[PDB]
């Protein structure tokens, strides 16, 4: 489900911001990556009856290539011990998220 997937991402983002230990932020990012990759294969209401090959659906899955890439970025920083950097990196997903709500809701 798409709306669940975003609940995951929004919740776990908060977990990173509020985190006390590096294990928290890495486990959060890992959860966010799956939800993101999960959402990419969904189709939202505004494109209910659009072809999977259409521009709109190409755009949908393309945007998630950014969101996953930005997550992957934060995950790599965390896995490399740049854990403060991984946290700042994750703040960027708010911009990505705003572009989603703006376009599909």
């Amino acid at each position, epitope marked *: 489900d798409l709306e669940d997937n975003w609940e995951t991402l929004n919740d776990n983002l908060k977990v990173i911001e509020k985190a006390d230990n590096a294990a928290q932020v890495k486990d959060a990012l890992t959860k966010m990556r799956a939800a993101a990759l999960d959402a990419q294969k969904a189709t939202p209401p505004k494109l209910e009856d659009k072809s999977p090959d259409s521009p709109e659906m190409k*755009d949908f899955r393309h*945007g998630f290539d950014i969101l996953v890439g930005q997550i992957d*970025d934060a995950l*790599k920083l965390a896995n490399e011990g740049k854990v403060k950097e991984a946290q700042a990196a994750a703040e960027q997903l708010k911009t*990505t998220r705003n*572009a989603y709500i703006q*376009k599909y809701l």
Partner: antibody, heavy 122, light 107 residues
């Protein structure tokens, strides 16, 4: 002080190949996002590709997708733009740029190379 | 593909350049300055933040689906071309630059 010094531009014929260099000094190119931005004679800035070396995440404009290939060599501390199947419309001054933090590209590109001219012509 | 727009103004003039976004422009936009032969310089980052060493007569604001670069009093060395970095939209290319605006001396 962050410095980006480019090289590799020059002449090439349609369909040829050419590899641009963006040599970085003042920071470790591993932890950054490097971007190529080009500008055809008399026209505007067009973003082309970017790479986050440490993570390998890579992005491309549609106009060069499948033909260009951005990369980085951290030991040499430089990023590259491999340009294959070139055409006349690829004639431009090519810049490399980098944001403040590896993840702040959407806020602006702070540092720029000086640019190198690429002329595609037979 | 596109050539810069042009605009004539005198020293001391107030000029405001507008870039148009396909949605609520929100924060992650930038403004660059470029003079001939030279790379662009970052002027305004994050919609309204003044980059270092940029005079305070430059300012950047944002309203609805538009965002703006304002030069409160054009100085001779502000005649240049100005570029905006469009806000990302879902599915778009990672970075997109606006058309470009060349400010020239009225006489």
């Amino acid at each position: 002080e962050v410095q980006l010094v480019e090289s590799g531009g020059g002449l090439v014929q349609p369909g040829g190949s050419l590899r641009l260099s963006c040599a970085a000094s003042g920071f470790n190119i591993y932890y950054s996002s490097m971007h190529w931005v080009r500008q055809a004679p008399g026209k505007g800035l067009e973003w082309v590709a970017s790479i986050s070396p440490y993570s390998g995440s890579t992005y491309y404009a549609d106009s060069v997708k499948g033909r260009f290939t951005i990369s980085a060599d951290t030991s040499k501390n430089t990023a590259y733009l491999q340009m294959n199947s070139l055409r006349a419309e690829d004639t431009a001054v090519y810049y490399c740029a980098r944001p403040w933090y590896p993840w702040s590209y959407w806020s602006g590109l702070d540092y720029w190379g000086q640019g190198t001219l690429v002329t595609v012509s037979s | 593909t596109q050539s810069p727009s042009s605009l004539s103004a005198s020293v001391g003039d107030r000029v405001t350049i507008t870039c148009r976004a396909s949605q609520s422009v929100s924060s992650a936009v930038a403004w660059y300055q470029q003079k001939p032969g030279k790379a662009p310089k970052l002027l305004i980052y994050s919609a309204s933040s003044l980059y270092s060493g940029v005079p305070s007569r430059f300012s950047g604001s944002r309203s609805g689906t538009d965002f703006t670069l304002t030069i409160s009093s054009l100085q001779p060395e502000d005649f240049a071309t100005y570029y905006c970095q469009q806000p990302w939209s879902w599915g778009s290319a990672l970075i997109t630059f606006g058309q470009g605006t060349k400010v020239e001396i009225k006489r």
